[PDB]
Design a protein around this ligand. Sequence first.
Ligand SMILES: Cc1cc2nc3c(=O)[nH]c(=O)nc-3n(C[C@H](O)[C@H](O)[C@H](O)COP(=O)(O)OP(=O)(O)OC[C@H]3O[C@@H](n4cnc5c(N)ncnc54)[C@H](O)[C@@H]3O)c2cc1C
Ligand SMILES: Cc1cc2nc3c(=O)[nH]c(=O)nc-3n(C[C@H](O)[C@H](O)[C@H](O)COP(=O)(O)OP(=O)(O)OC[C@H]3O[C@@H](n4cnc5c(N)ncnc54)[C@H](O)[C@@H]3O)c2cc1C
Ligand SMILES: NC(=O)C1=CN([C@@H]2O[C@H](COP(=O)(O)OP(=O)(O)OC[C@H]3O[C@@H](n4cnc5c(N)ncnc54)[C@H](OP(=O)(O)O)[C@@H]3O)[C@@H](O)[C@H]2O)C=CC1
Ligand SMILES: NC(=O)C1=CN([C@@H]2O[C@H](COP(=O)(O)OP(=O)(O)OC[C@H]3O[C@@H](n4cnc5c(N)ncnc54)[C@H](OP(=O)(O)O)[C@@H]3O)[C@@H](O)[C@H]2O)C=CC1
Ligand code: NA
Ligand code: NA
Ligand code: NA
Lengths: 490, 486
Amino acid sequence: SHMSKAFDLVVIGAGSGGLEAGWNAATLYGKRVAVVDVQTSHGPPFYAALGGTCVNVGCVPKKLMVTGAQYMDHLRESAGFGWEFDGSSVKANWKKLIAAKNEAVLDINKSYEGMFNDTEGLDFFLGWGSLESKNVVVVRETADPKSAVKERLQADHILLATGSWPQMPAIPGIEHCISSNEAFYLPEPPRRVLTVGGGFISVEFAGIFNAYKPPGGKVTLCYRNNLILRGFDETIREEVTKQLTANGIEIMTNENPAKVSLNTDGSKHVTFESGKTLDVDVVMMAIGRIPRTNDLQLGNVGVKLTPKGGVQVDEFSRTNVPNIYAIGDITDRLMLTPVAINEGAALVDTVFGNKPRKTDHTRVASAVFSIPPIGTCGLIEEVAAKEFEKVAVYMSSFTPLMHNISGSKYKKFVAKIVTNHSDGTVLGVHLLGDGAPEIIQAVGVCLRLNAKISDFYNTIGVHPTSAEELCSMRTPSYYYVKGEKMEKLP
Amino acid sequence: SKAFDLVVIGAGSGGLEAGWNAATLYGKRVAVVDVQTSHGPPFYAALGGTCVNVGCVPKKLMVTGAQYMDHLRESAGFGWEFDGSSVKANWKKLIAAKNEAVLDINKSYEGMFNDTEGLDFFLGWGSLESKNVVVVRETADPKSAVKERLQADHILLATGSWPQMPAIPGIEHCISSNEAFYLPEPPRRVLTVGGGFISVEFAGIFNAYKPPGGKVTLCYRNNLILRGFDETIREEVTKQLTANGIEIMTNENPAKVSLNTDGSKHVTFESGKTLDVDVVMMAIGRIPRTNDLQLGNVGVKLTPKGGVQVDEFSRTNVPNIYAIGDITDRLMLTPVAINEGAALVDTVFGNKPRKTDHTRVASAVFSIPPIGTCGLIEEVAAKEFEKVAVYMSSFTPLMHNISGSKYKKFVAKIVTNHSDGTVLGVHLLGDGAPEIIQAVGVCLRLNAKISDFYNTIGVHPTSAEELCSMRTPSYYYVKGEKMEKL
Ligand SMILES: Cc1cc2nc3c(=O)[nH]c(=O)nc-3n(C[C@H](O)[C@H](O)[C@H](O)COP(=O)(O)OP(=O)(O)OC[C@H]3O[C@@H](n4cnc5c(N)ncnc54)[C@H](O)[C@@H]3O)c2cc1C
Ligand SMILES: Cc1cc2nc3c(=O)[nH]c(=O)nc-3n(C[C@H](O)[C@H](O)[C@H](O)COP(=O)(O)OP(=O)(O)OC[C@H]3O[C@@H](n4cnc5c(N)ncnc54)[C@H](O)[C@@H]3O)c2cc1C
Ligand SMILES: NC(=O)C1=CN([C@@H]2O[C@H](COP(=O)(O)OP(=O)(O)OC[C@H]3O[C@@H](n4cnc5c(N)ncnc54)[C@H](OP(=O)(O)O)[C@@H]3O)[C@@H](O)[C@H]2O)C=CC1
Ligand SMILES: NC(=O)C1=CN([C@@H]2O[C@H](COP(=O)(O)OP(=O)(O)OC[C@H]3O[C@@H](n4cnc5c(N)ncnc54)[C@H](OP(=O)(O)O)[C@@H]3O)[C@@H](O)[C@H]2O)C=CC1
Ligand code: NA
Ligand code: NA
Ligand code: NA
């Protein structure tokens, strides 16, 4: 038919948050739900598809890629333990990796497809959603608001969950640059590659490129200021920098690309603000991601943006427009998949359940799948020290015995616990080293339960592990007193 | 003769924690006794204990070395190419690297003694001469050349345990974990005997380093290995060791062993079956090392099971004599022995009478794949709580759809008291499980409920996030009866 369809809830963007939102509303609460996305499976032209950034061009494939990359390390380090093979025969075949990543991704797409053909009151619509009015979502053939209309969807409640998009700086020859999106689809691993940025994506990808580089290859990461990974634990920022360098990656600090042009042979000639130069085969910009509001036509209903660009929301995910809600990266609070998932469930429960619920944005466990990986939950010391007269820091940082054998002496495992010293409350835990992301999950539960240093300490360690460092620390290495760092209390 | 506040017999995980704590927190004058200064035959354990010498430390390295068999094969799926026929597992190298690491620990333990005041070390064999006197002789025999007479206000028994050997003909042609640590070469065919920690861990080790053509056989006298651990996990870990080429013989138990002309061993099981192997390793339990203490001179009391009797404070029936760690038979874990030592010295020379909590202790089996657990298994919970709920997730992580090890199901189980949602037990199988479970131990000391886990935000992608995404029970035990619904 040529008639519009009517829903309790339309969700725009079928990603981490939107999927959880939709599924919950239908299966839990018996609501009729519509979900809109631009593409049924991963890749060009739109990259994100059904399943979101996570599944298609994010969490899932990067983690498979980082996992592939860790074999570089494993193969070398096995020698310490008696493994002998022909080192000269060793090749890292990127196309195989990328083909296997694509098959895995596509299965997830296909199963999502399955589910929406199956579940009562959960319908999928292919196209570009925008807001026509308070209770009408329009689905057009492209982002152009003048493209043809495929559907009009009537909605009592509209959820906005279109996520984010890579930020590209406006510099000469920016068109010779890629983002993470294109990185996932490179026909060949680059011989020379520059990853611009000192954050999650740059540091994770550098690790990937570094393992898969052809012979004579070089990965370079540039960062515009002095120390990468602002927002993370200072000891950890400095350590991951040592460790990345130790594994063959050049970290250029205080350097920022000013322009890019093509050499005669087609490679990329980068000029930094400092005037320094660098030739690479690929320049990947990873300088941030921004909420995807531009195509929603929010102007039509009057949904307000933050000064920043995200949809403004209250703690309950509600926009200034009564029945229109936003979640996930589109709000630009915390950009994480399981955060987006939690926001979706809390929204749905609130709107369609009998009992309001808000997502807790503090104490969120999270990771960097760098080589080696970070795992963190809670406040860094310098932030705690601005909010508490007395702050204790417990630090353990040592090369693990397995790594005096493996030959990777530079692989210090770091475990840091941050306390309000007045009362023992654990404010933050920061880890670096193998297993950090896994160790950290349960630490999330601890912080929720208002854990204290003595709670960890009284817990009997599992031995031999890295994790047990968290449960053998009773004496602070240092303190901050009025925001002042000191070895001892006066 | 020489006088001391505390004499510690046994320089192991527990002994050392207690002695140091006694010297350096309480300023006491401490003597610690041990039979050997570094690792290996003929007494195997030494300064550092079983842990350091012939337990936790060296086996975790060895297991780590074993894991590479999987990584090497598994890299292929992610695009790694190399010549798989060039791949040799060099055991002599593994052993020499292991020996070197353990030697450095023995060395830095000597160092520690020379650098700490009120902490003295005595080489030799410790016996209780009388309520307040510890003699050190040259050998384990009570009539050997007395080396030292230590006068003691307090005596800590910290001698640990020893491999149990069954009384069967040809038992002298078997080895234990001790000798396993020192084999000149990796066995081609080997029988690990027993269904517990050590059998399972070593099986994993021999399976990786076995020369071309080899086979590891693990045998267990009953139907399913690893009694005492979660049931789904005993089944799965079985399946997964099988998938990695380990033959698991259930309901089988050696009745005798003999020497074959080639140096290998002929094993006859009770059932009548036979098997030829290069090495039979008995891993059928560990018993409290009591026999050389001459406990009869003081009359320190044993239990039926064989270990020194203590109260919750680690005190013997004899006033100033205490026992901690494996000798007491409570929980044979290194960090349990370290905590036991700590608590005892806080009761005695502190103002703070302290007792170790043996419930909710996280621990691991370093099997390939590994296990991690804290708290009750469901069959035990159902005997103690009217309503028990079980939340379960079990499936192959996506990385192992690509590695091609499709059989590495990751298992996460949460066992609650369904009445109030209290988490009673968590059980894990899969890479990371021993790391994942450490903080889970902390949770249980904060009366975490199933909803605390679920309402925590996951870290994605991890195996661990599985613990924070289980909302609905898979099944229930009502009054002891397993049912799907209520
Ligand atoms: C390379 C990379 C790696 C990452 N790794 C991790 C990680 O390891 N762990 C982690 O926790 N987070 C990771 N993230 C972040 C994580 O992916 C996001 O926080 C999460 O995807 C946000 O979920 P969401 O629902 O808000 O949006 P998304 O998952 O992005 O879903 C948005 C969906 O909306 C669609 N869409 C956009 N506009 C329209 C339109 N108008 N009409 C219809 N559909 C539209 C898009 O196609 C997309 O599918 C990573 C991100 C990137 C880029
Ligand atoms: C192969 C193996 C692997 C293991 N792996 C782990 C693991 O990964 N994690 C874990 O938590 N636990 C593990 N364990 C168990 C763990 O080692 C014990 O629970 C722990 O060592 C207990 O320590 P203890 O202080 O009670 O005595 P020990 O650590 O065993 O030390 C006792 C010391 O007493 C000495 N001694 C004995 N008699 C005398 C005497 N008469 N005079 C002087 N000295 C004497 C011995 O030489 C020994 O060094 C493992 C055990 C084995 C056998
Ligand atoms: N495993 C995980 O959890 C992952 C999470 N993510 C999520 O996606 C978000 C975005 O990832 P990402 O793109 O790496 O962004 P981030 O915001 O994490 O980091 C961006 C980096 O670019 C630098 N930068 C910012 N602006 C500029 C500029 N104009 N010119 C030059 N450099 C600049 C920043 O420096 P400065 O400090 O000076 O601002 C910072 O070093 C992440 O914050 C995270 O929330 C992404 C990948 C993996
Ligand atoms: N990583 C860690 O934390 C480790 C800790 N350890 C510690 O050391 C202790 C001892 O290790 P282990 O040697 O494996 O002993 P365990 O008690 O762990 O396992 C013993 C196995 O031997 C079987 N068995 C018992 N008696 C006999 C018998 N008479 N004849 C034949 N078989 C028998 C038992 O079967 P049944 O169930 O039927 O009684 C059981 O399956 C462990 O329990 C653990 O506490 C050891 C290694 C690693
Ligand atoms: Na502890
Ligand atoms: Na000394
Ligand atoms: Na959760």
